[model samples]
Target: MNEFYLKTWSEWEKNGTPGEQRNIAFNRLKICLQNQEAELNLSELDLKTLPDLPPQITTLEIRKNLLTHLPDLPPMLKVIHAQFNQLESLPALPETLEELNAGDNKIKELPFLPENLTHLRVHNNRLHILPLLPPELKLLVVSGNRLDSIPPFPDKLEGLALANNFIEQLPELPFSMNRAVLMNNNLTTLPESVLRLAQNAFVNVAGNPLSGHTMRTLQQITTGPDYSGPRIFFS
Candidate 1:
């Protein structure tokens, strides 16, 4: 029902201003003209604030709201079903986005995504760092949140979900991931270049305080396990 929302709802019901402030400014301009359609399925619109979006949306869906910062997007936006909401901060993005659920909210940093991101859903929120990572991301989800360490990753990321949070070391796993999800979190030990990439990549360091009998423990204090350090040759 676009058309500038029926000419801005017939000029806000002609001369706006009536009961309930013209019905919350005509329902925030009818959800910002139904978010410039391409696919919109709004849900729980508390309409607290932040609603000027619609610069050619390409799949928008507000799943509940109580928003707290994060509004200045939509340059042909593409996919963003912002979940819950109370966002801690996030106002920078619009490179024909690729997918972002932003689960829960109160996100603590790490939101300048868009290196042509593939898919990311931040479950809960309060991420404790982990910024640089976007080599055309494939799929990632930071479950719960308040991470305590786990930087360096993205040599071709491929599906990863970190459950709970408060991680406990393993500050080494800078590459090669093909499907992982360390549940709970607070690992006590599990490093062997991460168990030689877990038998064939597709891990899940269950719960935390890991103690599945650490094996290959980085070949007894790793040093010069140089499997060619880091190579990426192509022509």
Candidate 2:
């Protein structure tokens, strides 16, 4: 046991409590102070509220539940697989988080994100705006929502999927992007900045109204049964 836990227990015992309250507080503190390095799997439990989590938990799996609110995350948590739940709001995210999968939920807004995030998949929600993106993000998938515009992308982003949304225009893309999926939106024209990226990237601009020349050029680039590169969609 940790020395701090021992001292806290000693003080609690000395104060003496009304039986049940003392036991409850003691148990909560004990679990909070339990510093074991392991992953916590609490998925499919039909839980409405969460109990005290371990202090040193690394990975947490709480997907497919009836949870409406997120529990306070552990400081050492790195990865979270919390998709397909009834979560309407999230708690404050820890700084050590690297990947977050919160798809297929009823979340309304994103909380303050961590700076070291790499992969984020929050599709199929009711989000109207995006939070400030982290610098280290490489893969971002926020498709199938009500987003109207995209924010400034990080220079290190590689894969971006924003298909099936209400977006009408795209922001200036990062030069390092290699794969972009922008199908089924309301785009009618491409910016010069977007056209400049087609020379060295794979872009999917299908299901959007394009001018005659632009459509012809894209068709020529993506023609044939084997051609695969930057192209436009005529369907």
Candidate 3:
């Protein structure tokens, strides 16, 4: 079944005891399948049994629940929004995953990212180490974790937002990026490699204490027209 099934089940549990509500719900579910669109909201629901999904279902949103484990997904599924759940580990992903949101969960460590992922939003989790990312990642938003160092750069990331964590060091980065945000953490100093980025690349490093040598090193790393902004001043 699809999200439509979950929604129908919820409504049935609440109001199907009435006259024709149950039958009407079934008929509507049939129509939803024929039209190839299902709107299932399994939030705060006990998904103890991992159910198989319809192959044609492309999108699924199952946020804020007691699902300890993730179920196998259909091959054609593209977007999964399962944030704020009790998932300790993620299941193997379908190859078609483009957007994944798994925030506010009990995930201590992130799993290997999907190669085709473009947008990933996982904040307010307990990740101490970075996951091996998919090469196609364009946006990564991770904050409020226990990371002591920033993970190595993804090959082609365009936007990055990491704030309110315990990061003290950052790994070297390649020259491909356009935007970045690293604020409100326990960083002793910003890396000099931050300057080698292209002028159009945006970067932010605030709320980190730095020594004089670290400041100079960061200044020296920046080259070209300083096209990103005011040179990412760290004050």
Give per-residue lDDT, candidate 3, residue 217: 63
Q: What is the lDDT of residue 96 in candidate 3?
A: 77
Location of the lowest summed lDDT over 10 successive residues in candidate 2: 17-26
Candidate that beats the other on lDDT, 1 or 3, i.e. the better one: 3
Rate residue 170 of model 1 by lDDT.
57
Candidate 1 per-residue lDDT, tens place, 1-235, comes to: 5676567555645653332244554555566566544654444655444445556658777667665775678777778887898878777877888888888988788767788878888788887876766777777788888878766566667667887888787545535665577767777776555544533455666556545354234333334454422221111
Error of 2 at 105 (Å): 0.3
Cα TM-score of candidate 3: 0.73
Candidate 3 weakest lDDT stretch, 10 residues? 16-25
Model 1 lDDT-worst window of ten: 226-235
Return the lDDT, model 1, position 160: 76
lDDT of 1 at 226: 46
For all predicted structures, in order, the TM-scores are 0.39, 0.76, 0.73
Please give the TM-score that candidate 2 achieves against the real structure: 0.76
- Per-residue CA lDDT of model 3 for 82-165, tens digit only, reads 887778878777887788898887788776677799998888888887877777788888888777766677778777778888
Tens digits of per-residue lDDT for model 2 on 1-235?
5767557665654565343234444454465456464676767655454554666878888787666787679899989888888888788889998989998888878998899898988888778888989988998888888888877789899888888887887877777777888888888766545544544577777888777876666555456565543443445
